[PDB]
PDB file of C-alpha atoms and ligand atoms in Angstrom:
ATOM      1  CA  UNK A   1     -11.629  16.042 -29.896  1.00 34.20           C
ATOM      2  CA  UNK A   2      -9.002  16.825 -27.285  1.00 34.08           C
ATOM      3  CA  UNK A   3      -8.551  18.716 -24.025  1.00 33.13           C
ATOM      4  CA  UNK A   4      -5.772  20.660 -22.320  1.00 33.98           C
ATOM      5  CA  UNK A   5      -5.428  21.059 -18.563  1.00 33.55           C
ATOM      6  CA  UNK A   6      -2.624  22.675 -16.622  1.00 34.44           C
ATOM      7  CA  UNK A   7      -0.831  21.577 -13.473  1.00 34.91           C
ATOM      8  CA  UNK A   8      -0.339  23.480 -10.219  1.00 33.07           C
ATOM      9  CA  UNK A   9       1.402  22.668  -6.943  1.00 35.12           C
ATOM     10  CA  UNK A  10      -1.185  20.807  -4.870  1.00 34.81           C
ATOM     11  CA  UNK A  11      -1.213  18.333  -1.975  1.00 37.39           C
ATOM     12  CA  UNK A  12      -3.035  15.040  -2.445  1.00 38.51           C
ATOM     13  CA  UNK A  13      -3.858  11.933  -0.421  1.00 39.16           C
ATOM     14  CA  UNK A  14      -3.456   8.763  -2.481  1.00 38.74           C
ATOM     15  CA  UNK A  15      -4.993   5.437  -1.497  1.00 37.75           C
ATOM     16  CA  UNK A  16      -2.809   2.476  -2.406  1.00 38.04           C
ATOM     17  CA  UNK A  17      -4.146  -0.998  -3.129  1.00 40.00           C
ATOM     18  CA  UNK A  18      -2.529  -4.172  -1.824  1.00 40.97           C
ATOM     19  CA  UNK A  19      -0.970  -4.783  -5.241  1.00 40.39           C
ATOM     20  CA  UNK A  20       0.401  -1.254  -5.061  1.00 41.43           C
ATOM     21  CA  UNK A  21      -1.854   0.633  -7.452  1.00 43.99           C
ATOM     22  CA  UNK A  22      -3.523   3.966  -6.743  1.00 41.91           C
ATOM     23  CA  UNK A  23      -7.266   3.325  -6.614  1.00 39.62           C
ATOM     24  CA  UNK A  24      -8.574   6.580  -5.103  1.00 43.47           C
ATOM     25  CA  UNK A  25      -7.382  10.042  -4.152  1.00 45.21           C
ATOM     26  CA  UNK A  26      -8.360  13.164  -2.227  1.00 40.90           C
ATOM     27  CA  UNK A  27      -7.598  16.726  -3.309  1.00 38.44           C
ATOM     28  CA  UNK A  28      -7.010  18.473   0.001  1.00 38.85           C
ATOM     29  CA  UNK A  29      -7.854  21.988  -1.113  1.00 38.22           C
ATOM     30  CA  UNK A  30     -11.346  21.447  -2.512  1.00 42.19           C
ATOM     31  CA  UNK A  31     -13.747  22.018   0.482  1.00 43.92           C
ATOM     32  CA  UNK A  32     -13.798  21.603   4.296  1.00 45.29           C
ATOM     33  CA  UNK A  33     -14.332  17.832   4.252  1.00 46.07           C
TER      34      UNK A  33
ATOM     35  CA  UNK B   1      24.553  -4.664   0.217  1.00 46.73           C
ATOM     36  CA  UNK B   2      24.459  -2.004  -2.486  1.00 48.96           C
ATOM     37  CA  UNK B   3      21.714  -2.107  -5.148  1.00 47.87           C
ATOM     38  CA  UNK B   4      22.572   0.503  -7.772  1.00 45.70           C
ATOM     39  CA  UNK B   5      22.770   3.236  -5.157  1.00 45.47           C
ATOM     40  CA  UNK B   6      20.725   1.772  -2.297  1.00 43.66           C
ATOM     41  CA  UNK B   7      23.245   1.123   0.475  1.00 45.86           C
ATOM     42  CA  UNK B   8      22.139  -1.024   3.390  1.00 43.55           C
ATOM     43  CA  UNK B   9      22.552  -3.995   5.723  1.00 42.72           C
ATOM     44  CA  UNK B  10      20.405  -7.010   6.426  1.00 42.04           C
ATOM     45  CA  UNK B  11      19.189 -10.426   5.407  1.00 40.42           C
ATOM     46  CA  UNK B  12      17.880 -10.767   1.845  1.00 39.61           C
ATOM     47  CA  UNK B  13      14.999 -13.126   1.137  1.00 38.09           C
ATOM     48  CA  UNK B  14      12.916 -14.223  -1.850  1.00 36.20           C
ATOM     49  CA  UNK B  15       9.752 -12.163  -2.046  1.00 37.50           C
ATOM     50  CA  UNK B  16       6.197 -12.745  -3.162  1.00 41.83           C
ATOM     51  CA  UNK B  17       5.088  -9.114  -3.561  1.00 42.77           C
ATOM     52  CA  UNK B  18       4.107  -8.318  -7.154  1.00 40.94           C
ATOM     53  CA  UNK B  19       6.242  -5.240  -7.832  1.00 44.11           C
ATOM     54  CA  UNK B  20       4.237  -3.552 -10.596  1.00 43.98           C
ATOM     55  CA  UNK B  21       6.254  -3.497 -13.815  1.00 41.96           C
ATOM     56  CA  UNK B  22       7.592   0.005 -13.077  1.00 42.04           C
ATOM     57  CA  UNK B  23       8.190  -0.019  -9.324  1.00 40.85           C
ATOM     58  CA  UNK B  24      11.890   0.212  -8.476  1.00 37.90           C
ATOM     59  CA  UNK B  25      11.522  -0.626  -4.714  1.00 41.81           C
ATOM     60  CA  UNK B  26       9.149  -1.234  -1.677  1.00 41.48           C
ATOM     61  CA  UNK B  27       8.320   1.626   0.808  1.00 43.53           C
ATOM     62  CA  UNK B  28       7.128   0.832   4.440  1.00 44.30           C
ATOM     63  CA  UNK B  29       5.038   3.104   6.735  1.00 42.46           C
ATOM     64  CA  UNK B  30       7.517   5.222   8.716  1.00 44.33           C
ATOM     65  CA  UNK B  31       9.562   5.185   5.512  1.00 43.63           C
ATOM     66  CA  UNK B  32      12.207   2.445   5.661  1.00 39.81           C
ATOM     67  CA  UNK B  33      13.375   0.446   2.649  1.00 41.77           C
ATOM     68  CA  UNK B  34      12.043  -3.081   2.977  1.00 37.21           C
ATOM     69  CA  UNK B  35      12.098  -4.522  -0.543  1.00 39.13           C
ATOM     70  CA  UNK B  36      14.335  -4.157  -3.590  1.00 36.63           C
ATOM     71  CA  UNK B  37      14.428  -5.401  -7.157  1.00 35.99           C
ATOM     72  CA  UNK B  38      17.612  -6.978  -8.455  1.00 40.25           C
ATOM     73  CA  UNK B  39      18.668  -5.017 -11.547  1.00 38.28           C
ATOM     74  CA  UNK B  40      20.085  -7.974 -13.464  1.00 37.41           C
ATOM     75  CA  UNK B  41      17.461 -10.675 -12.899  1.00 37.91           C
ATOM     76  CA  UNK B  42      14.565  -8.302 -11.973  1.00 41.10           C
ATOM     77  CA  UNK B  43      13.202 -10.177  -8.960  1.00 39.43           C
ATOM     78  CA  UNK B  44      11.842  -8.706  -5.755  1.00 38.77           C
ATOM     79  CA  UNK B  45      13.697  -9.439  -2.519  1.00 36.90           C
ATOM     80  CA  UNK B  46      12.703  -8.491   1.014  1.00 35.30           C
ATOM     81  CA  UNK B  47      15.248  -6.917   3.320  1.00 38.93           C
ATOM     82  CA  UNK B  48      14.786  -8.156   6.871  1.00 34.14           C
ATOM     83  CA  UNK B  49      16.936  -6.495   9.567  1.00 34.84           C
TER      84      UNK B  49
ATOM     85  CA  UNK C   1     -15.947  25.021 -25.463  1.00 30.63           C
ATOM     86  CA  UNK C   2     -14.880  24.224 -21.906  1.00 30.04           C
ATOM     87  CA  UNK C   3     -15.554  21.115 -19.865  1.00 29.34           C
ATOM     88  CA  UNK C   4     -15.167  19.807 -16.325  1.00 27.72           C
ATOM     89  CA  UNK C   5     -12.719  17.099 -15.342  1.00 30.34           C
ATOM     90  CA  UNK C   6     -13.926  15.133 -12.388  1.00 29.32           C
ATOM     91  CA  UNK C   7     -11.030  13.121 -10.958  1.00 26.10           C
ATOM     92  CA  UNK C   8      -8.462  12.974 -13.730  1.00 28.76           C
ATOM     93  CA  UNK C   9      -4.737  13.434 -14.143  1.00 29.78           C
ATOM     94  CA  UNK C  10      -3.306  11.426 -11.253  1.00 31.06           C
ATOM     95  CA  UNK C  11       0.123   9.929 -11.860  1.00 29.20           C
ATOM     96  CA  UNK C  12       2.506   7.877  -9.758  1.00 30.90           C
ATOM     97  CA  UNK C  13       4.873  10.482  -8.290  1.00 32.12           C
ATOM     98  CA  UNK C  14       7.758   8.031  -8.643  1.00 32.44           C
ATOM     99  CA  UNK C  15       9.048   4.497  -8.328  1.00 29.05           C
ATOM    100  CA  UNK C  16       8.804   2.791  -4.943  1.00 24.69           C
ATOM    101  CA  UNK C  17       6.050   0.367  -4.019  1.00 25.07           C
ATOM    102  CA  UNK C  18       3.431   0.565  -1.294  1.00 23.68           C
ATOM    103  CA  UNK C  19       0.633  -1.449   0.259  1.00 23.95           C
ATOM    104  CA  UNK C  20      -2.460   0.127   1.797  1.00 24.34           C
ATOM    105  CA  UNK C  21      -0.551   3.210   2.827  1.00 22.88           C
ATOM    106  CA  UNK C  22      -2.468   6.451   2.512  1.00 22.11           C
ATOM    107  CA  UNK C  23       0.482   8.326   1.098  1.00 23.25           C
TER     108      UNK C  23
ATOM    109  CA  UNK D   1     -27.687 -10.886  29.278  1.00 26.09           C
ATOM    110  CA  UNK D   2     -27.687  -7.248  28.180  1.00 28.59           C
ATOM    111  CA  UNK D   3     -24.024  -6.536  28.890  1.00 25.09           C
ATOM    112  CA  UNK D   4     -23.305  -9.270  26.362  1.00 22.39           C
ATOM    113  CA  UNK D   5     -25.464  -7.624  23.691  1.00 24.73           C
ATOM    114  CA  UNK D   6     -24.242  -4.081  24.279  1.00 26.52           C
ATOM    115  CA  UNK D   7     -20.643  -5.245  23.966  1.00 27.49           C
ATOM    116  CA  UNK D   8     -21.203  -7.773  21.169  1.00 23.77           C
ATOM    117  CA  UNK D   9     -22.876  -5.051  19.081  1.00 22.41           C
ATOM    118  CA  UNK D  10     -17.230   1.170  24.255  1.00 20.69           C
ATOM    119  CA  UNK D  11     -13.622   0.276  25.079  1.00 20.63           C
ATOM    120  CA  UNK D  12     -12.421   3.711  24.053  1.00 21.37           C
ATOM    121  CA  UNK D  13     -10.332   4.257  27.167  1.00 24.73           C
ATOM    122  CA  UNK D  14      -8.298   1.167  26.340  1.00 27.66           C
ATOM    123  CA  UNK D  15      -8.078   2.048  22.658  1.00 21.00           C
ATOM    124  CA  UNK D  16      -6.755   5.533  23.391  1.00 24.45           C
ATOM    125  CA  UNK D  17      -3.683   4.400  25.306  1.00 23.92           C
ATOM    126  CA  UNK D  18      -2.792   2.018  22.479  1.00 26.62           C
ATOM    127  CA  UNK D  19      -3.265   4.763  19.893  1.00 24.47           C
ATOM    128  CA  UNK D  20      -1.184   7.327  21.808  1.00 23.31           C
ATOM    129  CA  UNK D  21       1.784   4.984  22.160  1.00 20.44           C
ATOM    130  CA  UNK D  22       1.710   4.009  18.480  1.00 17.76           C
ATOM    131  CA  UNK D  23       1.371   7.637  17.370  1.00 18.98           C
ATOM    132  CA  UNK D  24       4.442   8.495  19.426  1.00 18.43           C
ATOM    133  CA  UNK D  25       6.534   5.578  18.199  1.00 19.55           C
ATOM    134  CA  UNK D  26       5.741   6.522  14.605  1.00 18.57           C
ATOM    135  CA  UNK D  27       6.725  10.140  15.147  1.00 18.67           C
ATOM    136  CA  UNK D  28      10.028   8.908  16.559  1.00 15.96           C
ATOM    137  CA  UNK D  29      10.883   6.934  13.416  1.00 15.37           C
ATOM    138  CA  UNK D  30       9.614   9.606  11.026  1.00 15.53           C
ATOM    139  CA  UNK D  31      12.259  11.943  12.457  1.00 19.30           C
ATOM    140  CA  UNK D  32      15.079   9.796  11.064  1.00 19.50           C
ATOM    141  CA  UNK D  33      14.391  11.479   7.741  1.00 17.63           C
ATOM    142  CA  UNK D  34      14.817  15.156   8.545  1.00 19.01           C
ATOM    143  CA  UNK D  35      17.928  17.195   7.834  1.00 21.39           C
ATOM    144  CA  UNK D  36      17.812  19.643  10.748  1.00 19.23           C
ATOM    145  CA  UNK D  37      19.920  21.866   8.502  1.00 15.53           C
ATOM    146  CA  UNK D  38      22.263  19.451   6.774  1.00 16.00           C
ATOM    147  CA  UNK D  39      22.854  18.369   3.203  1.00 15.72           C
ATOM    148  CA  UNK D  40      20.974  15.078   3.567  1.00 14.25           C
ATOM    149  CA  UNK D  41      19.465  12.700   6.115  1.00 12.85           C
ATOM    150  CA  UNK D  42      21.799   9.789   5.339  1.00 11.44           C
ATOM    151  CA  UNK D  43      25.212   9.310   6.896  1.00 10.58           C
ATOM    152  CA  UNK D  44      26.339   7.348   3.844  1.00  8.72           C
ATOM    153  CA  UNK D  45      25.703  10.521   1.831  1.00  7.26           C
ATOM    154  CA  UNK D  46      27.663  12.882   4.054  1.00  5.82           C
TER     155      UNK D  46
HETATM  156  C1  LIG E   1      20.669 -10.470 -17.535  1.00  6.05           C
HETATM  157  O1  LIG E   1      21.503 -11.532 -18.005  1.00  6.05           O
HETATM  158  C2  LIG E   1      20.924 -12.832 -17.873  1.00  6.05           C
HETATM  159  C3  LIG E   1      21.912 -13.884 -18.379  1.00  6.05           C
HETATM  160  O2  LIG E   1      23.065 -13.898 -17.536  1.00  6.05           O
HETATM  161  C4  LIG E   1      19.637 -12.900 -18.700  1.00  6.05           C
HETATM  162  O3  LIG E   1      19.025 -14.180 -18.523  1.00  6.05           O
HETATM  163  C5  LIG E   1      18.164 -15.349 -19.029  1.00  6.05           C
HETATM  164  O4  LIG E   1      16.908 -15.072 -18.375  1.00  6.05           O
HETATM  165  C6  LIG E   1      15.749 -15.560 -19.071  1.00  6.05           C
HETATM  166  C7  LIG E   1      14.543 -15.145 -18.261  1.00  6.05           C
HETATM  167  O5  LIG E   1      13.720 -14.232 -18.977  1.00  6.05           O
HETATM  168  C8  LIG E   1      15.844 -17.069 -19.257  1.00  6.05           C
HETATM  169  O6  LIG E   1      14.722 -17.529 -20.001  1.00  6.05           O
HETATM  170  C9  LIG E   1      17.135 -17.414 -19.981  1.00  6.05           C
HETATM  171  O7  LIG E   1      17.266 -18.824 -20.116  1.00  6.05           O
HETATM  172  C10 LIG E   1      18.323 -16.854 -19.214  1.00  6.05           C
HETATM  173  N1  LIG E   1      19.569 -17.185 -19.886  1.00  6.05           N
HETATM  174  C11 LIG E   1      20.522 -17.929 -19.315  1.00  6.05           C
HETATM  175  C12 LIG E   1      21.741 -18.194 -20.149  1.00  6.05           C
HETATM  176  O8  LIG E   1      20.406 -18.363 -18.175  1.00  6.05           O
HETATM  177  C13 LIG E   1      18.676 -11.805 -18.228  1.00  6.05           C
HETATM  178  O9  LIG E   1      17.501 -11.815 -19.042  1.00  6.05           O
HETATM  179  C14 LIG E   1      19.371 -10.445 -18.349  1.00  6.05           C
HETATM  180  N2  LIG E   1      18.490  -9.397 -17.830  1.00  6.05           N
HETATM  181  C15 LIG E   1      18.629  -8.126 -18.257  1.00  6.05           C
HETATM  182  C16 LIG E   1      17.722  -7.047 -17.724  1.00  6.05           C
HETATM  183  O10 LIG E   1      19.485  -7.852 -19.071  1.00  6.05           O
HETATM  184  C1  LIG E   2      -4.416  -7.543  -7.471  1.00  8.69           C
HETATM  185  O1  LIG E   2      -5.458  -7.059  -6.635  1.00  8.69           O
HETATM  186  C2  LIG E   2      -6.632  -7.878  -6.648  1.00  8.69           C
HETATM  187  C3  LIG E   2      -7.680  -7.137  -5.856  1.00  8.69           C
HETATM  188  O2  LIG E   2      -7.085  -6.163  -5.011  1.00  8.69           O
HETATM  189  C4  LIG E   2      -6.298  -9.247  -6.065  1.00  8.69           C
HETATM  190  O3  LIG E   2      -7.460 -10.068  -6.092  1.00  8.69           O
HETATM  191  C5  LIG E   2      -5.183  -9.893  -6.872  1.00  8.69           C
HETATM  192  O4  LIG E   2      -4.760 -11.097  -6.247  1.00  8.69           O
HETATM  193  C6  LIG E   2      -3.983  -8.948  -7.001  1.00  8.69           C
HETATM  194  N1  LIG E   2      -2.910  -9.533  -7.807  1.00  8.69           N
HETATM  195  C7  LIG E   2      -2.916  -9.877  -9.114  1.00  8.69           C
HETATM  196  C8  LIG E   2      -4.178  -9.627  -9.903  1.00  8.69           C
HETATM  197  O5  LIG E   2      -1.926 -10.371  -9.641  1.00  8.69           O
END
């Protein structure tokens, strides 16, 4: 069982923790919100 | 100072910020270098102005 | 078959640290 | 006694002048990393 996605040029908004890890993100080309 | 490419000026101080084992340096909002890691001993140091 | 990722495939764009900075 | 509740639970005109000044000071520093048509943004690289 395995999957294969592909990558495109997007723009994201990454939320950084206080230790410096990415905990959440926003894909800015999904919907109006 | 020059840290393997990073050229700058300032006071260096012992840090307490846990640089994740894979983070070369510290980035500050408005994008100015404010922490480094010493290549030889691998400890994080703040760079006050 | 095909399936739907939900929020998957996020990597650290590089070195550098960061605290609470919506980058 | 009701002023105290309504505030303890509105100062937008004071918040806006703080926000505007900070938003301008950040835009000033964020311009120290544009080329304006040069090879880099660092004088130690030119
Ligand atoms: C760089 O060289 C130094 C030695 O000059 C290495 O140091 C030792 O560091 C470890 C810490 O993990 C101590 O337990 C040892 O006692 C140290 N040795 C001495 C003689 O002081 C260091 O590990 C090296 N780092 C790299 C990345 O090569
Ligand atoms: C990592 O983050 C957690 C929660 O954000 C915090 O409690 C902890 O002190 C941090 N540092 C660690 C686990 O070394």
